[PDB]
């Protein structure tokens, strides 16, 4: 039960690792949360350029209120995608490193 | 050397 290209190889690399059946069983339930972070990040990754074009379209209109309102939503939206960016990366590094060490010996 | 000693 996986779709992300990053997660798929991790599960494949997990089945060749040192993981005990209980460790392997708990490993899957962590990848499920890891994908949810990615799909949340991916969803906002679209929303950044959608609102970026929305911000650009409004700036061409020239209304100071709509420009200010969209910008206020925009910068907070950038924080949302930026903050989720590291959380995905941090979780990716730990998961990749753990299977790297489990396959190291 | 190969001696076990």
């Amino acid at each position: 039960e996986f779709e992300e290209p990053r997660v798929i190889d991790l599960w494949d690399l997990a089945q060749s690792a040192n993981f005990t059946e209980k460790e392997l069983e708990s490993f899957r339930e962590e990848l499920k949360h890891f994908e949810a972070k990615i799909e949340k990040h991916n969803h906002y990754q679209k929303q950044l350029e959608i609102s970026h074009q929305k911000l650009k379209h409004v700036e061409s209109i020239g209304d100071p209120e709509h420009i200010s309102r969209n910008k206020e939503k925009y910068v907070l939206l950038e924080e949302k995608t930026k903050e989720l960016g590291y959380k995905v990366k941090k979780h990716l590094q730990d998961l990749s490193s753990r299977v790297s060490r489990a396959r190291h010996n | 050397x190969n001696x076990x000693x």
């Binding site: 040192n18 993981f19 949340k40 | 190969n2 000693x5």
Partner: protein, 1166 residues
């Protein structure tokens, strides 16, 4: 549609209540509830559970920094508490009642007048700063201050802001609450508030007492130190190292590393009894599990953390992986955690770490500035853990999650070498090896720890004996043993789905699929070592020993084999020259034989006929012994260097390897006849043999050519495995399933490769001191039968010996001194050819077990026979004592001379210490050295180093912080003074690493510098095949042979291109596959007329011919003349021979078997 957000949005279903602000009005997570965090997770104040490893990894994980809340101590982020001020000269804060009170309180005088820097304790600033509440004097001027519960605002320094009084370290013992209603202290059940801020034990509990080890004996004393009772004195020169106690059963448990045993006694005395006496060679520490009545203990010979019952049974090994030097241990059964300290790990770093009480989830609790953690105690009510350091000389505290790190005592002048630690109420009780005393110190901040029972030895253990020290709880394993078949071990309360326990299995069994029923284990990897013989699982998922390790103080184990029928393990101890057998769980150990052994290289066990074989490198022979009756026969003799022996019962052959200069692998019948070479070419140093039972092939390792080969049992179809990466000196090997488990001497590790071509080498265990043999324990392969094990009649009708023979036959044999009769099945005594022999020579005492030692070893106070036969009944009936011993005045006992006047009372009547004159001679200590008050000379550089080099504490006396280091010493900043030899030694001795700061390496020409410049290695390790350097720079750029050729120093085989040393060309023996190294152009060799010429080309004296010794080393001088009576006195380059011609390929080409064609050896297509 979807989840309509608080302001009308189609928020996805899984976004709500994911610990994230998703709704635009911050309302997407209010109406639900979350999960709680399991024992392996950290709750980050928002309900978000994160991995325990993410706590203080240096990275904020909860946009609150809740998991990095100051896990480094003594930092720059002071922001000091109310009524405090910072003197600019250092990272220190001092309360206002001290600041400018007239006395220097920052040690540098930075809180009093310093005219040299133009600073005075002024007050004029208040006149214009206009303080909101109050003012005080500082070296800056009048400083504004505000009452407790509030701190000076940092924008202006004139206003003051509401502050949490509960956040100051030590505001109240245990816990405090009521922020709005001013700070107030709460004391839990059994505790009452006295004087305020001081929790005190309830009167309903018995008087608190401190039990501790003064260095040799267990002592007991009350908190105030008014009385001191000796609870248990040590016997047989013992030593009480680590103590602990159970309150409900009122028992005290302590470990005696010297006697090598664990003891338990009642608190009032009496009922003293041993708890463990096997495989506890060094029980460093101890901790009881009062809730489940278990006894966790730390063992350091074979590094592990075991679990036993309070009476010693049901041993289970919990944590073994990566343990290098476990020293401290503590646990909290209420929540389920287990804490232990490791002052050196195999990876290199020392660590204080947390785990469940079954070792499920290990987490490095403290890693930075950890040095040598030596003892762990924990505040069971505030949820904190206290540990000490002997190297950086501090006592420090972190939460159960390791978040809030705080220091309570530090500095070499305060805690030079703490070992143990315990706490009660508000005082931490720790023992120190340098001040040689138990010490009392406040649990929050101690400026000068008070003394408590100063001792004359190293105090090794301390713990507080009180009821409140062991809280009151319900064990999950109390419900019919938790359903576990054998052992029920606790865990974290949230583990196992909330049960709070897991079932464990004893040594001889394994846990089934239902993790409830224990079944007998069938296979595990058995390997020996210089230190111990250990059995480990074949899979690397769990690295916990499956059998209890076999160990001894004097020990060198080399040969091993197993008997799966009775679950016993045979082994040989090269230091005692005794062959033992021991059960898997360690219960029953006896000796197989101990007579006439010199160096038993390898054992092997014929599981069907029950005959134990072993090679003897000293006697140069192999011996077979039967177990049912101790018949013994030396079947093969006159070898040169026999190392490895493997016996094949069903097939009938025994296989053997000799690594002398004409090395060969020989095979013979189990009888010992038909001894013929099986592999005697292209071979040198065949250190080990193994049989692939699934395919009937014989594997062996070569330590000279650094290769693994295999062949059929006839020596034909010989194939060579692929190149193994770092195998440079293999010793032993075994074959189990698809993999071969090779042991390496130089690596000191067990490596695993595939039996097909080698392939994916995986290291099983690194760091073995001297690994020696490996063996695959397997109950499946120890089955089957032949004519030696028919059910209808006894052992093949042979009386003493029956041996399997190829083509499924059998032959009989007879012991030494006994001859097979005409029936070929029954034996009779033959005193004519094999007359009786005594246990051993004259200048030796025959011991009971079969050993015998040089006579003068009789009655010298040392057990040399290893069964106390030579020390039995000394000093009576002219059964006298050796000069090397000390005789007791009334007789009946003799002790080693080192025990005479040694300050220990060894002899029963005390004669060994009575009338002992002093040694206060007229002697000088060298002026380059320092004189200990014990009158032992130490280098003058070892003074005030916080180490007790004098063993009396003289060198560290008067070493207060007010002082210098000697001109030949380096100063650690407010830590200690060290010898310059520790400056750029490689490791940080300083608390802040000032000894290793920014200096560069001076590697000599006898050494090689790695490319990364990290470290140097000896020139011998340059270009050897092992990556000594971290970046593998030592092996980069190393010389190689030309493709298909050999170095100028070597010689190339014509048949198959094998490279052999140049000396092996023209040395009489065909070291090549087709005799290429003994061609017709070989100049022969002769010897002197007074010398005989052996078949292999050696020269031996005229009188030495047939003298009875293997002078020729190939038996030529003995086999030749037996007349000794009874008396009482071409495609390539060609070479010409007499009529034929010899076709020689050029180097890099190999000859085809037809004898004319040559083939290029390089795989490069032309």
């Amino acid at each position: 549609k979807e989840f309509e957000c608080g302001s009308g949005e189609c928020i996805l279903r899984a976004y709500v209540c994911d610990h994230d602000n998703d709704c635009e009005d911050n309302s997407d997570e209010r109406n639900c509830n979350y999960d709680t965090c399991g024992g392996h997770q950290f709750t980050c104040s928002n309900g978000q559970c994160i991995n325990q490893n993410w706590v203080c990894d240096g990275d904020d994980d909860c946009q609150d920094s809740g998991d990095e809340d100051g896990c480094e101590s003594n930092q720059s982020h002071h922001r000091c508490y109310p009524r405090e001020w910072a003197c600019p000269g250092s990272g220190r804060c001092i309360s206002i009642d001290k600041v400018c009170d007239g006395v220097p309180d920052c040690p540098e005088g930075d809180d009093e007048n310093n005219v040299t820097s133009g600073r005075t304790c002024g007050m004029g600033v208040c006149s214009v700063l206009n303080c909101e509440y109050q003012c005080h004097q500082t070296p800056f001027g009048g400083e504004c201050f505000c009452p407790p519960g509030h701190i000076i605002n940092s924008n202006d320094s004139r206003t003051c802001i509401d502050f949490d009084d509960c956040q100051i370290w030590g505001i109240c013992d245990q816990k405090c609450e009521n922020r709005q209603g001013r700070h107030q202290c709460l004391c839990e059940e059994g505790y009452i508030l006295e004087r305020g801020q001081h929790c005190k034990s309830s009167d309903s509990f018995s008087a608190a007492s401190v039990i501790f080890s003064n260095g040799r004996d267990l002592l007991v004393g009350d908190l105030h130190g008014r009385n001191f009772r000796i609870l248990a004195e040590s016997k047989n020169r013992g030593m009480v190292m680590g103590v602990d106690f159970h309150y409900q059963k009122h028992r005290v448990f302590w470990t005696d590393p010297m006697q090598e045993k664990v003891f338990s006694t009642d608190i009032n005395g009496l009922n003293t009894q041993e708890i463990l006496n096997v495989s506890v060679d060094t029980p460093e520490n101890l901790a009881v599990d009062w809730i489940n009545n278990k006894l966790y203990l730390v063992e350091t010979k074979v590094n592990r953390i075991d679990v036993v019952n309070l009476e010693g049974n049901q041993r289970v090994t919990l944590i073994t992986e990566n343990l290098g030097h476990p020293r401290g241990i503590a646990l909290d059964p209420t929540v389920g955690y287990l804490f232990f300290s490791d002052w050196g790990s195999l990876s290199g770093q020392p660590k204080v770490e947390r785990a469940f009480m079954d070792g499920s989830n290990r987490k490095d609790l403290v890693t930075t500035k950890v040095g040598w953690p030596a003892g762990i105690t924990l505040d069971l009510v505030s949820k904190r853990v206290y540990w000490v350091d002997s190297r950086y000389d501090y006592i420090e505290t972190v939460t159960y999650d390791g978040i809030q790190r705080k220091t309570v005592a530090r500095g070499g002048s305060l805690v030079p070498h703490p070992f143990g630690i315990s706490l009660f109420e508000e005082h931490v009780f720790f023992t120190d090896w340098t001040k040689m005393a138990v010490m009392k110190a406040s649990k929050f901040t101690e400026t000068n720890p008070q003394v408590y029972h100063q001792s004359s030895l190293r105090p090794h253990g301390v713990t507080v004996y009180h009821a409140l020290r062991q809280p009151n709880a319900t064990n999950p394993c109390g419900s019919n043993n938790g359903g576990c078949a054998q052992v029920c071990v606790l865990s974290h309360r949230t583990d196992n789905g909330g049960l709070g326990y897991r079932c464990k299995c004893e040594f001889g069994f394994e846990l089934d699929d239902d993790e409830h029923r224990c079944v007998a284990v069938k296979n595990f990897l058995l390997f020996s070592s210089k230190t111990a013989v250990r059995g480990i699982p074949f899979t690397l998922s769990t690295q916990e020993d499956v059998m209890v390790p076999v160990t001894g103080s004097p020990s060198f184990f080399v040969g091993i084999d197993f008997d799966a029928q009775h679950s016993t393990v045979f082994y040989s101890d090269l230091s005692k020259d005794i062959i033992y057998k021991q059960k898997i769980d360690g219960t029953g150990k006896e000796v197989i034989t101990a007579n006439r052994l010199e160096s038993v290289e390898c054992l092997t066990f014929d599981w069907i006929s029950r005959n134990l074989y072993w090679t003897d490198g000293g006697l140069k022979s192999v011996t077979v012994l039967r177990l049912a009756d101790k018949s013994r026969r030396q079947i093969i003799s006159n070898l040169n260097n026999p190392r490895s022996i493997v016996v094949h019962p069903t097939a009938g052959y025994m296989f053997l390897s000799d690594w002398f200069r004409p090395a060969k692998i020989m095979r013979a019948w189990s009888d010992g006849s038909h001894l013929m070479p099986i592999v005697n070419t292209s071979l040198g140093w065949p250190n080990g043999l193994a049989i692939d039972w699934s395919a009937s092939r014989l594997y062996w390792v070569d330590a000279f050519f650094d290769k693994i080969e295999h062949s059929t049992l006839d020596g034909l179809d010989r194939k060579r495995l692929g190149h193994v990466d770092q195998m440079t000196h293999p010793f032993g090997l075994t074959v189990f399933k698809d993999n071969v488990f090779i042991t390496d001497w130089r690596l000191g590790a067990i490596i695993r490769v595939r039996k097909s071509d080698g392939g994916d080498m995986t290291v099983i265990r690194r760091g073995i001191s001297s690994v020696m043999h490996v063996k695959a324990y397997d109950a499946d392969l120890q089955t089957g039968s032949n004519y030696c094990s028919q059910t209808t009649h006894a052992n093949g009708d042979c009386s003493h010996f029956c041996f399997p023979v190829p083509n499924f036959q059998r032959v009989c044999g007879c012991p030494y001194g006994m001859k097979l009769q005409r029936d070929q099945m029954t034996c009779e005594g033959d005193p004519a050819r094999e007359p009786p022999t005594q246990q051993c020579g004259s200048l030796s005492f025959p011991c009971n077990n079969g050993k015998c030692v040089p006579s003068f070893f009789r009655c010298d106070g040392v057990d040399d026979c290893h069964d106390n036969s030579d020390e039995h009944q000394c000093g009576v009936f002219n059964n006298t004592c050796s000069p090397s011993a000390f005789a007791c005045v009334r007789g009946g006992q003799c002790i080693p001379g080192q025990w005479h006047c040694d300050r220990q009372n060894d002899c029963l009547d005390g004669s060994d210490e009575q009338n002992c004159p002093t040694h206060a001679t007229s002697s000088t200590c060298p002026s380059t050295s320092f004189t200990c008050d014990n009158h032992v000379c130490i280098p003058k550089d070892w003074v005030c180093d916080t180490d007790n080099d004098c063993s009396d504490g003289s060198d560290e006396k008067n070493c207060q912080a007010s002082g210098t280091c000697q001109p030949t010493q380096f100063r650690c900043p407010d830590h200690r003074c060290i010898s310059p030899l520790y400056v750029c030694d490689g490791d940080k001795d300083c608390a802040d690493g000032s000894d290793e700061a920014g200096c560069v390496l001076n590697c000599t020409s006898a050494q090689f510098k790695c490319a990364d410049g990290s470290s140097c290695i000896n020139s011998r390790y340059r270009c050897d095949g092992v990556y000594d350097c971290r970046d593998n720079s030592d092996e980069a750029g190393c010389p190689t042979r030309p493709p298909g050729m050999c170095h100028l120093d070597e010689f190339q085989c014509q048949g198959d291109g094998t490279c052999i040393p140049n000396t092996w060309e023209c040395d009489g023996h065909p070291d090549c596959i087709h005799g290429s190294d003994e061609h017709t152009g070989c100049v022969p060799k002769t010897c002197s007329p007074t010398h005989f010429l052996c078949d292999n080309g050696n020269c031996i004296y005229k009188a030495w011919i047939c003298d009875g010794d293997n002078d020729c080393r190939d038996m030529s001088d003995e086999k030749d003349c037996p007349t000794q009576p009874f008396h009482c006195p071409c495609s390539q380059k060609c070479e010409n021979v007499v009529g034929s011609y010899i076709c020689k390929c050029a180097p890099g080409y190999i000859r085809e078997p037809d004898g004319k064609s040559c083939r290029q050896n390089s795989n490069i297509e032309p």
